Structure formats: structure tokens, C-alpha cells
Amino acid sequence: TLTIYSGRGQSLVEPLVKQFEAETGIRVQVRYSTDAQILAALQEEGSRSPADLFWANTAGALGQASAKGLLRPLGETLLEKPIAFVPASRTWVPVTVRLRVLAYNPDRIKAEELPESLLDLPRFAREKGLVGRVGWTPTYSSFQDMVAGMIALYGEEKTREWLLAMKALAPKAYPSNPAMLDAIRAGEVDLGSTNHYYVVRFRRAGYRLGMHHFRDGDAGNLALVTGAGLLKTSKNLAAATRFLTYLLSPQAQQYFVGNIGEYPLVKGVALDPNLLPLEEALAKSPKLDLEKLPLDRALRLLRETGVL
CATH class of the missing domain: 3.40.190.10 (Periplasmic binding protein-like II)
Known part of the structure; x- marks a missing residue:
């Protein structure tokens, strides 16, 4: 047995x-x-x-x-x-490994205009007039890991700044990643951070969906x-x-x-x-000890900021 x-x-x-x-x-x-x-x-x-x-x-x-x-x-x-x-x-x-990525609607968002860092996403959205048109999944385990990674790389205070700046965009919260990608497809929101395989599954079904990676080492590529x-x-x-x-x-x-x-x-x-390539996914990922991601601190911060 x-x-x-x-x-x-x-x-x-x-x-x-x-x-x-x-x-x-x-x-x-x-x-x-x-x-x-x-x-x-x-x-x-x-x-x-x-x-x-x-x-x-x-x-x-x-x-x-x-x-x-x-x-x-x-x-x-x-x-x-x-x-x-x-x-x-x-x-x-x-x-296995999975990557955080930024999904987007290519009809509404130009690949070349997307920020090289997740930290600059709120400024991008503000500039591009995306108030109410950004999606996220605050209750999702991998989103919470990503926030933990941000705390590890940048510290709690820079992460707090990002969280509150995201909140200020009136983003739409989705209960699941497929719900969010359906909304991106539908044009309800124009982009949102997700795991790469959700985008893969959508593309295998015939849906054109953009997948943006941030610069090598960025928290957004956890x-x-x-x-x-x-x-x-x-x-x-x-x-x-x-x-x-x-x-x-x-x-x-x-x-x-x-x-x-x-x-x-x-x-x-x-x-x-x-x-x-797998080797490229590793290269792009933030250089962190993945056994020590501060998930507890991330959850506390998400609750304190009112995101959770």
C-alpha cells in the first residue's frame, strides 16, 4: 500500500x-x-x-x-x-513548474506598451485609462504567492504601495482564473495577472489571448x-x-x-x-528561495490593505 x-x-x-x-x-x-x-x-x-x-x-x-x-x-x-x-x-x-504571467486582450492592449515590471502596472493602467478594466484574483493561492514574492524582493512597504495603487484602479476581482480570462476575452477587463497554463488552455481552445512576461528577475514572473x-x-x-x-x-x-x-x-x-523554454522560464523568474516565500506576511498585508 x-x-x-x-x-x-x-x-x-x-x-x-x-x-x-x-x-x-x-x-x-x-x-x-x-x-x-x-x-x-x-x-x-x-x-x-x-x-x-x-x-x-x-x-x-x-x-x-x-x-x-x-x-x-x-x-x-x-x-x-x-x-x-x-x-x-x-x-x-x-x-512541475508554473509561471505567473500577465494575460491581456491583444485587440485592446499593445504588447510593446506593457511595462517591464509588475510594479509599474498601476501607472500603466492609469495612463492607458484602464480604471475598472483590470482584473485580479485576490483569493487565489498563486496570486498570494506572487504578493509574497514581492514582499521578499522589494519589502513590505513597496508591496503595500503596489497593492493600494492596484486597489485605486477599481479592479474587478474574479473567483477563478478561467472567470478572469473569460472576462478578458469578453472585453469586460483588458488584462490581469495569472498562471501561464490558464492562458495555454484558452489558446488551445482557439481563443487568442496575449501573454506578457516581465523583465528577467521581476516579481511578476514568479x-x-x-x-x-x-x-x-x-x-x-x-x-x-x-x-x-x-x-x-x-x-x-x-x-x-x-x-x-x-x-x-x-x-x-x-x-x-x-x-x-524551461531554461528561459527559470531565467526570467525572480531569484528567491522558493522554500521561504513569506506567505503569512502576504496574507496579513492583503487583509490589512483591504484587498482580502
């Missing part, structure tokens, strides 16, 4: 788990919860936890688990598979790393390691880029046009 605690969504995970089970004969039980809830549970359970693996939606959650000493060091065979994003701790393996780690409490380490190895296999990695639209981290997969 194998028990996985998954902070990743059931619709994304289940097909891979079902396939693993079918091909190895290993019985897999999955708990579907949030990264945050899983962290709380593992702290609660202590040495008592039934979990073998933590498959997280975020590097930040794996960093936390590592910091709490929950994760088992991984070996070089596994850790040499991913092209990039291997944590310093070497206590979990990265599995790399959103997913990954998995072996829990020290695991009584099924061999089976768990086999599953981690499977997640980094070409067929699983093809599922990630194809079915999900995320960046795969290994060679031997057929790569998208709607993606820039």
Missing part, C-alpha cells in the same frame, strides 16, 4: 495514481486536501501519521515540512532527473514550483520512492505538459509552442 497526502487537485492527480496502481499493482490511497491543511495535519499527527508522501501544490509548503523536519533526504538518482528547481535541502523533488517529498514516518519507503520516480518519468511529464499545461522538468517530452 501507499498513502499520499495531496495538496494538488484530485482531477490532476487521480489519473496518474490510477495509472500507477494499474501498472505496479501497488494500492494507493490519496487524501485530497490543501497544502495548509496537510501541514497542520502532519504537525498534529507527528510520528503517528499514516502518510508516506506529501505531494504539494507549492514549494513553500514543502519548505515548511522540511523545516519541521518531516521529510527524508532524497538520493542523487532521483534528484538529478529534474532540469532545475531542486531545493537546497534536497528533501523533496520538484515535479516561478510556482510543485513537488513531492517522502515523509520520515513512511513505512513504505520503496513504494513511495517508486512513485516519486514515476512522477518524473517521461510519460507522466508528458501528462503534465499536455493534460495540465504545466512546465515539465525533464527531457523526453514533446514540448509546446505556448511555452517558452
Whole structure:
């Protein structure tokens, strides 16, 4: 048997788990919860936890688990598979990466006019007369990561300035990224920060949608790393390691880029046009320790500014 605690969504995970089970004969039980809830549970359970693996939606959650000493060091065979994003701790393996990007309506917005920094987006919107025509997703986990990245790069006060300047635009808040991109398509708003794969999915369906990257190193290009780690409490380490190895296999990695639209981290997969090279995504991303993103400070700041 194998028990996985998954902070990743059931619709994304289940097909891979079902396939693993079918091909190895290993019985897999999955708990579907949030990264945050899983962290709380593992702290609660202590040495008592039934979990073998933590498959997280975020590097930040794996960093936390590592910091709490929950994760088992991984070996070089596994850790040499991913092209990039291997944590310093070497206590979990990265599995995919996703990028913050700026989606926009190309009929209303000229690519060449967009700012090279996310920090200058509010000034752009003001100048271009986009009051009420900017979208955002304040309740969305990756938006909150992006705000955390801004705090890490620029400090809380510059981030506060940006948040209040965004608020001053009377932006429209959407409950989901597809809702926001539908609104961009519809011309209700002209641009909004999102994850790259939402744009990919819209383009695969036939919808022309702009995707803007900020200059290399900008907070607006935050790399959103997913990954998995072996829990020290695991009584099924061999089976768990086999599953981690499977997640980094070409067929699983093809599922990630194809079915999900995320960046795969290994060679031997057929790569998208709607993606820039993986090496370029890394180059463009802000240079931060992704295990230490100050998410708690971001949430506090979002509440204090009235954004949340």
C-alpha cells in the first residue's frame, strides 16, 4: 500500500495514481486536501501519521515540512532527473513548474506598451485609462504567492504601495482564473495577472489571448514550483520512492505538459509552442528561495490593505 497526502487537485492527480496502481499493482490511497491543511495535519499527527508522501501544490509548503523536519533526504538518482528547481535541502523533488504571467486582450492592449515590471502596472493602467478594466484574483493561492514574492524582493512597504495603487484602479476581482480570462476575452477587463497554463488552455481552445512576461528577475514572473517529498514516518519507503520516480518519468511529464499545461522538468517530452523554454522560464523568474516565500506576511498585508 501507499498513502499520499495531496495538496494538488484530485482531477490532476487521480489519473496518474490510477495509472500507477494499474501498472505496479501497488494500492494507493490519496487524501485530497490543501497544502495548509496537510501541514497542520502532519504537525498534529507527528510520528503517528499514516502518510508516506506529501505531494504539494507549492514549494513553500514543502519548505515548511522540511523545516519541521518531516521529510527524508532524497538520493542523487532521483534528484538529478529534474532540469532545475531542486531545493537546497534536497528533501523533496520538484515535479512541475508554473509561471505567473500577465494575460491581456491583444485587440485592446499593445504588447510593446506593457511595462517591464509588475510594479509599474498601476501607472500603466492609469495612463492607458484602464480604471475598472483590470482584473485580479485576490483569493487565489498563486496570486498570494506572487504578493509574497514581492514582499521578499522589494519589502513590505513597496508591496503595500503596489497593492493600494492596484486597489485605486477599481479592479474587478474574479473567483477563478478561467472567470478572469473569460472576462478578458469578453472585453469586460483588458488584462490581469495569472498562471501561464490558464492562458495555454484558452489558446488551445482557439481563443487568442496575449501573454506578457516581465523583465528577467521581476516579481511578476514568479516561478510556482510543485513537488513531492517522502515523509520520515513512511513505512513504505520503496513504494513511495517508486512513485516519486514515476512522477518524473517521461510519460507522466508528458501528462503534465499536455493534460495540465504545466512546465515539465525533464527531457523526453514533446514540448509546446505556448511555452517558452524551461531554461528561459527559470531565467526570467525572480531569484528567491522558493522554500521561504513569506506567505503569512502576504496574507496579513492583503487583509490589512483591504484587498482580502
